[PDB]
Symmetry: D2
Subunit: 292 residues, 4 copies
Amino acid sequence: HLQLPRPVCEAIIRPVPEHRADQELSEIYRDLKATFGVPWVGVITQAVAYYRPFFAEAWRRFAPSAKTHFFERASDDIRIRSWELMGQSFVIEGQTDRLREMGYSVREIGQIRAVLDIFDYGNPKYLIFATAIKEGLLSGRTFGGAAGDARCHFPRSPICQIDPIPVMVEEHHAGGTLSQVYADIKQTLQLPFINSNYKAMARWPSYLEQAWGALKPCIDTPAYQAGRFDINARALAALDALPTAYRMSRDDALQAGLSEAQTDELIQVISLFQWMLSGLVLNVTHFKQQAL
Amino acid sequence: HLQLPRPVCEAIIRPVPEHRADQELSEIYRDLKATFGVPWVGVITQAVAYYRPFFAEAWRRFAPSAKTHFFERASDDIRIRSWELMGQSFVIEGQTDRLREMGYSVREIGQIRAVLDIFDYGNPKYLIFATAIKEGLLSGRTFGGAAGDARCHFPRSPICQIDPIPVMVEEHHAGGTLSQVYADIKQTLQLPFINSNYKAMARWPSYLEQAWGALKPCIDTPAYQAGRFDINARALAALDALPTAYRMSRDDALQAGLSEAQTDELIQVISLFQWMLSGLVLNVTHFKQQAL
Amino acid sequence: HLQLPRPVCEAIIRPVPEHRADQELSEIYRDLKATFGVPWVGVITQAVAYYRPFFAEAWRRFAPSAKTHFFERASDDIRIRSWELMGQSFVIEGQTDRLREMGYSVREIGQIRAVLDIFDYGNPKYLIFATAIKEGLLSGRTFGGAAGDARCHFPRSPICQIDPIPVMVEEHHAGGTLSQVYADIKQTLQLPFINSNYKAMARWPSYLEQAWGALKPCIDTPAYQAGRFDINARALAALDALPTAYRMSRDDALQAGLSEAQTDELIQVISLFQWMLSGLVLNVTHFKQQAL
Amino acid sequence: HLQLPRPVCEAIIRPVPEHRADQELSEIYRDLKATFGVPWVGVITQAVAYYRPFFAEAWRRFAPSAKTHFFERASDDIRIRSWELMGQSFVIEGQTDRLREMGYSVREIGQIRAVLDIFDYGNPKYLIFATAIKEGLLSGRTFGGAAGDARCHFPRSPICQIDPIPVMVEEHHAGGTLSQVYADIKQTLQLPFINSNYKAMARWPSYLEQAWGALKPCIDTPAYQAGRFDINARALAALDALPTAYRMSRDDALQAGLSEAQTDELIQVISLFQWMLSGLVLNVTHFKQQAL
């Protein structure tokens, strides 16, 4: 029974979306995107940003790591691993023919694949970031900083995609049946928010119903839970070998400008996100293999 | 009391969307967009593109006029007239603050308006093109060609937006309720298809429901039908004063490579579109006034 | 013999370029651009931006008029006039074959024409705004605000291009022969700066060389000076017909935060730029006819 | 004292630039760019494009390996080795402060770095592809195909940057002093063409003058030559570990539609480009290190 505990939490999640961010926050958002090389600010980071003084500081200490060849490779290796697991554990029926007969052209299918690629690339990076924040607060420990192989400190593979923000059908954008599909995803993944990935997929509603329909039965199966732990374990491994040292303890959260009551709540918010993210990575992988 | 008769169309409408155009047709589509200065190909042009030898020739004869200062003013002046007519004939509520209550941020509402602007600007150009194609086929007459005021033949005000294609939720992207909204629109406006602007509005499903709900009771009221007649009449006036002579008769269709059967079918397709376009212009004006 | 006298100016101009504008200034810059519907901030407004609280206030007072149908038309009508004058007065030979033989492709020439259209469209708007700044300071008068045709107050032709900033070879970017062409232009036009449109033409050095060389002999011919006078006069006539009253006096400048010595300086700077802009409008027109 | 011998090239090179490629060739270019995930078509592939049925055939046989985790990783590792080599062998002074003295602002220098990143990322992909074309022709051999690590056959790190084409100051665009800077590079690098990256730096002529001036003394020092050999041998090694077998021999060229003499010509051409590419990787690495 390889594990992964869904956390003790329903402390309020107050994510600040990019279309509401003031220009101080937007500046940190821009730098995050620019550093990760992704066109979206993840919901994990939106929710941590509510604790803005901790967020700016947490990010300041993690950024030097995130700019490294190490971090690109360790993120990439989680993408590879997710691909490996989901192929071996599940028989994933291709969906292209069904989509074509639903009216979807080859170009449109191409656009759908391109959107999936953004999250297949990005999410591991948010997973590793989520893990440093959680483990740093909970444990007090200083992670990484070894000189080791000097190539691990080199600049990461350079070229991004930062504009535009992907088209996402926010919860308040949603129509009748779309709200039903979001509620389903919410209950099935046991979450109080809808991830960016499904929101971007929901630009093509019928495609999302079909894609989510295929994935849903696989959720929380024994192979699923086991892959989730493997992915969770590798994220913890990347954190243990950050090329630039990273510390951000409860006491660091105080000095950043947070109360102890605020730090506590943050801990429960990040635990939810960190747990969730390993699952989200397997989900996008499945979607991406559907679209083979 | 006046009004525009819906034509008797039983013919089959086969739009070729931009995401299915082959490379030959896509060239024509790009020339059309660049000429008009709009980021999208109209459903009118997509359906006429099915009759491709005719579409390519009719466009070659019409494009010289479309490039003129006259055609920009003539189009602009139909947008102004629609604004005027909908302002006088209709009490129209500002909906911006009801969208705020629904969750819509200031940036999001700005994006919505930007989208309305594209069609408010472009639709008259298509109405005039459609009118030319229809009257040319029915009358066999040569329209325009007067030297007149030399300034009418100058290049049009040159800035434009031609990429990206507006984000449109197509009928096969539609989930449950969005099909219901699309059905409601087709039935209420007497159309076998959904125009581009509604599809673009559909990226925000909840906004569309709201904006369509507020327009719907105005449809085919006396004042609507009177304004619609007036809009139509100006399209016909614009056709009469094209700077470059336009002729495209049933015979010209034959020599372009169409049969007489296909030409007859084309005459009803464009009649349906041309009628429709006067209504669409008022519809977008209403939306745009709602977003005030 | 109509000649537009060049104002005395030995004040120092200090443009704040877009790539150096801080957050605050950049926000004003973006509102400017979105209102004019241009992808670039003019040097005129860059220079005036140095006197920041004046720039901020003057723009707030001018923007309500710039958003209107009237302003779109009055700007556009100066373009038409420039086109008219330059065609009437000069035999302007095409340069397209010369460019083709120089190795320029049809796509490249397309690109060059697009760049020219940007400034053909936008400079009249900057010309009118310069005139309003200059005359409001000099005269203390309140301009416009009359009742008039209600359609003048309608929103302007909506579609815009706000991004990206055109590629411009700044003066610290330039090489040797580009520094010389830049210097010949500064000499001939009697200016201490290179205008945006010359810097954008400059992305193709060998093209600017040719285009500039052909325009140069026309500068300060009698027909050119006469046409420029006419162009200036129409900017003056627009100022009086502004739909929303504009007042920004010597005393408003003081109440905004400026010193007497600053306000004097601003007056010399805005008058050098106001004079310059009628010339620029003609120059772009000549380039654009060259490239037909 | 390792050196990479320069081949003899009697043959005329004939690049088909992206702005002249017809519809057919553009389609291949686009797939090339989509597969490599770079926004530009290398001069190498432009030159081979002249022998079109060969290029189309060599590409279709290479693209299966170019889409793989292996190719991404092998290309990335050549960038890393270049950074490593130049780091150890040279004391490379920052130049950001000199640029900032010349007038360049922080945003601007950011834009320069982004342009350098494109070529840092992309050239190793063109280098390996050039080596496969060369060695295929020279040796008749079949390269790669070994099953090996199954992970090697997974899709590469997904995310792309396909638009827009870098702003490049082509040779027919250049001024007098750029021509001579362009001649200097041709002479010093022993080439009859100007590579894409230098053409992109030339957008900032004063910066290219500076950055090239700083690289020139390092060219053909023993550490450079030695480093260049090493880069070369790593490209040969990548060739043997290709995940999909690649064969494109002299006979295959003949079957494709090339004549004997053309095949002779192609061989010299590809040989010169293959040789150039290892040095070009060093050069870009050096520029990028100057600008850190």
